[PDB]
Write a protein that binds this ligand. Structure first.
Ligand SMILES: *[C@@H]1O[C@H](CO)[C@@H](O[C@@H]2O[C@H](CO)[C@@H](O[C@@H]3O[C@H](CO)[C@@H](O)[C@H](O[C@H]4O[C@H](CO)[C@@H](O)[C@H](O)[C@@H]4O)[C@@H]3O)[C@H](O)[C@H]2NC(C)=O)[C@H](O)[C@H]1NC(C)=O
Ligand SMILES: *[C@@H]1O[C@H](CO)[C@@H](O[C@@H]2O[C@H](CO)[C@@H](O)[C@H](O)[C@H]2NC(C)=O)[C@H](O)[C@H]1NC(C)=O
Ligand SMILES: *[C@@H]1O[C@H](CO)[C@@H](O)[C@H](O)[C@H]1NC(C)=O
Lengths: 49, 50
């Protein structure tokens, strides 16, 4: 099926790659460390007028 | 300016001839290519890598 026929002659033939290999997905990123100061504005004792 | 070679002049004249009286054996080399490197290519692997 890589020569696209049903009869092949004597000799050596250089075929292709038709086998299918399953794959996964992965992702990596640095360490989240420097958070924003949301507590000071959302958890303040007194809010301005 | 390049020089074609050393200048010469043969003393040509009728009723005159020159005959060698000794010989020399010379061995010379000659190099000729015959074949090159056999190579093959994979289309899909080269074009669309994985
Ligand atoms: C404003 O302040 C309030 C109150 O201080 C804050 O709400 C609190 O947030 C914390 C965030 O950790 C909550 O704590 C959690 O509580 C639940 C049960 O309600 C627990 O299951 C959680 O346990 C997990 O985390 C622990 C580490 O803390 C692990 O050891 C554990 O194994 C679990 O993984 C966690 O303790 C807390 O309940 C709330 N409290 C209230 C009343 O909502 C709010 O987030 C602050 N706002 C801002 C914008 O910062
Ligand atoms: C032809 O050439 C050869 C090569 O030069 C001559 O042989 C030389 O002879 C002299 C004297 O006999 C020697 O000293 C050399 O060593 C020889 N050379 C060799 C052997 O390579 C030879 O004599 C010449 N013939 C004539 C008739 O002149
Ligand atoms: C030889 O050559 C000379 C010129 O160099 C010429 O005059 C003469 O006639 C010639 N003789 C013969 C026999 O060829």
């Amino acid at each position: 099926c890589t020569l696209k026929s049903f009869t092949v002659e004597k000799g050596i033939y250089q075929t292709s790659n038709f086998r299918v290999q399953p794959t996964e997905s992965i992702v990596r990123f640095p360490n989240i460390t420097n958070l924003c100061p949301f507590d000071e504005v959302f958890n303040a004792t007194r809010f301005a007028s | 300016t390049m020089s074609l070679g050393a200048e010469n002049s043969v003393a040509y004249s009728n009723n005159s001839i020159a005959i060698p009286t000794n010989f020399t054996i010379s061995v010379t080399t000659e190099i000729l290519p015959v074949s090159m490197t056999k190579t093959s290519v994979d289309c899909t692997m080269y074009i669309c890598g994985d």
